[PDB]
Design a protein around this ligand. Structure first.
Ligand SMILES: Cc1ccnc(N)c1
Ligand SMILES: Cc1ccnc(N)c1
Lengths: 268, 265
């Protein structure tokens, strides 16, 4: 992987692995999400961000600040097959005092065609109190050095899916998978649950017949609260319809919401 | 990745990913196990498989994992390049073996080694069977004919007998279930998941203060998509040793047994 000529975006190629594919011999949406996270880390390192697991700036380190995921939105047109080379381009943009955004474009390395795109929203939080915060002048300034200054958007369309409001699922859910717990392979280097695990947990409550007869086209997931190592999760799904579902992840005990989202599936 | 000049082994380089590392910023033993499985698949493809032989498909036969043994000296750090060399060998009518050597691409030093035993099974009845003359002949074309062993030693750890853990276990992690990311392309539970499940019952203080040096895992029965597993551990021991057992939560049916040796950091 490498930064592009202008130094305002980063590209990386990945060969799709045997263990990364599903029953149709193409990448799962979790493998895609992992590759998006990997190229994001490679970009942060190339532009001088800290290693240590947290991709923080020097001002963030002095003020005990971290980035927290608020939303992940992915749209896939073609999942790469086992052995294929997928090229991913990523870049960041500041969104005033609200937070920051990381966008991605996925391409077939052989044909050069776009096979997917993703967008993510990140908000500032104090690492110790876990209290949300607005982005300060000094953080916005250090972002201007490695972000395009004109808007560059993976989802440019006005009133598109990536910015849509997601409602809260009403009890009773049509489908469910209860008692989901993270194991050591679900944690990141800082022992926090990896963001991609939440996508897996959301999908667990989709019936296997939908997975066998349909392809996932779009997934939009809101992040509200982190699941701890010792927490237990319930994943709920209701068909809202192409097939569409409304999802909700909550703690098995108190019912505390941790995630909400939607998925759109196309018949094969 | 590519076959070596003689065509009797396969090498591949891997860059260690951010999501693949643990608390000390080095590869987990599950990431290593996944890389071992990946280079194995790339070797099989390069020698004409897809992973059965022509005779195996004709007779509805598949390979089933019987044992996995891994020894690590240095876990590669986040961003490092690890080179893995793999090769196969026939073991008469008993089964076959796949061996691995892990090296630091920069220094060229061996940082780990692994060995795996595979037995023949009919895909439909799930009944074990001996390797036939025709299958052994197929293996001769791409396996070294002189013995090449990752674990050469006559009484080494890789061939040791593993006993069954006695109730009550000292440690446990109950109600472990596979999710879709735990399955392979054929919807069978991935071999590496079992390693993760074994380690779940090791206390977090052991993981925080010790490094895994050796893991030996026997495979006895497959966990199905709808099965629930219990993972049990008892300390058998400056080195720490554990005896492990995976069994179904309902039945108590044994699926795996194994041992791990850990060294203090
Ligand atoms: C947006 C948000 C707020 C708080 N905690 C999170 N994990 C995410
Ligand atoms: C060795 C062995 C025997 C039967 N089933 C397995 N999965 C493994």
């Amino acid at each position: 992987g490498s930064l592009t000529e202008d130094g305002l975006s980063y590209k990386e190629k990945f060969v799709v692995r045997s263990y990364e594919v599903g029953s149709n011999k193409t990448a799962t949406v979790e493998t895609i999400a992992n590759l998006l996270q990997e190229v994001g880390c490679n970009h942060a390192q190339s532009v001088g961000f800290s290693t240590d697991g947290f991709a923080t700036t020097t001002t963030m380190r002095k003020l005990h600040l971290i980035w927290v995921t608020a939303r992940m939105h992915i749209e896939i047109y073609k999942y790469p097959a086992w052995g294929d080379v997928v090229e991913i381009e990523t870049w960041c943009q500041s969104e005033g005092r609200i937070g920051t955004r990381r966008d991605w474009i996925l391409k077939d390395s052989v044909t050069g065609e776009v096979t997917g795109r993703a967008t993510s929203k990140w908000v500032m939080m104090n690492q110790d109190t876990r209290r949300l915060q607005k982005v300060s002048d000094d953080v916005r300034d250090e972002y201007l050095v490695f972000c395009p200054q004109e808007p560059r958007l993976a989802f440019p369309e006005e009133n598109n899916r990536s910015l849509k409001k997601i409602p809260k699922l009403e009890d009773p859910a049509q489908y469910s998978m209860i008692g989901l717990k993270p194991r050591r392979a679900d944690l990141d280097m800082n022992q926090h649950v990896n963001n991609v695990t939440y996508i897996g947990w959301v999908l667990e409550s989709i019936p296997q017949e939908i997975v066998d007869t349909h392809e996932l086209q779009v997934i939009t997931l809101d992040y509200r609260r982190e699941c701890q190592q010792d927490d237990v999760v319930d994943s709920l799904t209701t068909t809202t319809s192409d097939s569409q579902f409304l999802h909700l992840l909550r703690l098995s005990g108190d019912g505390q919401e941790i995630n909400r989202g939607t998925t759109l599936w196309r018949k094969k």
